[PDB]
Amino acid sequence: AQLAAPLKVGAIYTIGPYLFPHLIPQLHRVAPQMPLYIEENFTHILRDKLRTGELDAIIIALPFQEADVLTKPLFDEPFYVLMPADHPWTAKASIDSELLNDKSLLLLGEGHCFRDQVLEACPNKHTTVESSSLETIRHMVASGLGVSVLPFSAVDSHHYAPGVIEVRPFSAPVPFRTVAIAWRASFPRPRAIEVLADSIRLC
Amino acid sequence: QLAAPLKVGAIYTIGPYLFPHLIPQLHRVAPQMPLYIEENFTHILRDKLRTGELDAIIIALPFQEADVLTKPLFDEPFYVLMPADHPWTAKASIDSELLNDKSLLLLGEGHCFRDQVLEACPTTVESSSLETIRHMVASGLGVSVLPFSAVDSHHYAPGVIEVRPFSAPVPFRTVAIAWRASFPRPRAIEVLADSIRLCSVARPQ
Numbered sequence: 001a002q003l004a005a006p007l008k009v010g011a012i013y014t015i016g017p018y019l020f021p022h023l024i025p026q027l028h029r030v031a032p033q034m035p036l037y038i039e040e041n042f043t044h045i046l047r048d049k050l051r052t053g054e055l056d057a058i059i060i061a062l063p064f065q066e067a068d069v070l071t072k073p074l075f076d077e078p079f080y081v082l083m084p085a086d087h088p089w090t091a092k093a094s095i096d097s098e099l100l101n102d103k104s105l106l107l108l109g110e111g112h113c114f115r116d117q118v119l120e121a122c123p124n125k126h127t128t129v130e131s132s133s134l135e136t137i138r139h140m141v142a143s144g145l146g147v148s149v150l151p152f153s154a155v156d157s158h159h160y161a162p163g164v165i166e167v168r169p170f171s172a173p174v175p176f177r178t179v180a181i182a183w184r185a186s187f188p189r190p191r192a193i194e195v196l197a198d199s200i201r202l203c
Numbered sequence: 204q205l206a207a208p209l210k211v212g213a214i215y216t217i218g219p220y221l222f223p224h225l226i227p228q229l230h231r232v233a234p235q236m237p238l239y240i241e242e243n244f245t246h247i248l249r250d251k252l253r254t255g256e257l258d259a260i261i262i263a264l265p266f267q268e269a270d271v272l273t274k275p276l277f278d279e280p281f282y283v284l285m286p287a288d289h290p291w292t293a294k295a296s297i298d299s300e301l302l303n304d305k306s307l308l309l310l311g312e313g314h315c316f317r318d319q320v321l322e323a324c325p326t327t328v329e330s331s332s333l334e335t336i337r338h339m340v341a342s343g344l345g346v347s348v349l350p351f352s353a354v355d356s357h358h359y360a361p362g363v364i365e366v367r368p369f370s371a372p373v374p375f376r377t378v379a380i381a382w383r384a385s386f387p388r389p390r391a392i393e394v395l396a397d398s399i400r401l402c403s404v405a406r407p408q
Contacts, residue, residue, distance in 0.1 A: 006344060020338040021358040027342070028363075035344035038335050039328070129239070136240050139222040143229065145208060145237035157358055159223040 010046040011059035018153035104146035121175035212248040213261035220352035306345035323374035
């Protein structure tokens, strides 16, 4: 106690894969004896589990407000455009958002908050592929199927040799999202939460 | 018949470790066929293959359905994943009976790899995937089992996780590809299969 027991952390699908690899060793450096029971899911589900006590702390994107749950913004994360290496846009330095409504744009299905954020960053012509992760989308743009949008932390977390996929920033103003941690106020281990947060910011 | 997009499904425990090698090889022998990709459970891929919204699926045996051709591609061994501090680090290989422990982390019920691991043995994190399992192992939560194609597919610096082979006889799965018998594009199937076979070849350091 109180840094001596497993901590149950949830995160949304479009954050966990890109955060945990950085998070775990940084957490380890401060916090050698606490392992993480991890779950990745949609926002509302992580919220329900946070409420029922199945999860102790969740990682979501704003907006997010929950009874008896404290919510601290952790950082901001700009979006980037993902494309095949032979795509015309590779000649551009940045991509204006208005260019993005086109059948060639590949989106997550409903339920993903990132989907709505991307849609809001755009000016109805799209391709939605359900039961998809961001990685699956990266694979299909790598095969030359279309083009997509990623959060910053995901752009280089892949195992593709150079010359397969290219990433270009958005033209100003760059759309982004706000990453935040949530935990319940009555949580008997506040120092575990602070360790978690501090470790997240140092990434 | 190699200038149109091909619709491919694969099970959760195969795709993430296959596509990073499959896509380049595929453009290299077939640069005008992009993949529409889906990852899901075996039965869902089966149904999607039968309905025709998928053209081919990549699965593990056993697998046999009427009016569906199935071609075994290769054998992939299993490996044991552990924290870098874990005492099993001292071991060269790990006896399968040692996976009789609550430390052992498994996938949900819908995954065929769960069953395969359970068959190779004497707690379950639900709706999990292998990467999440890797993360929790990396945090020190326990120990797990991976297919070989997944043991290097991570972004942790060395010194965080370690992998050891099973003691002989080593457990394995058989990766295969399935497609409709009267599928109008057999050549694409053959390319895809060969490319998949190539992926099974681990590139030396």
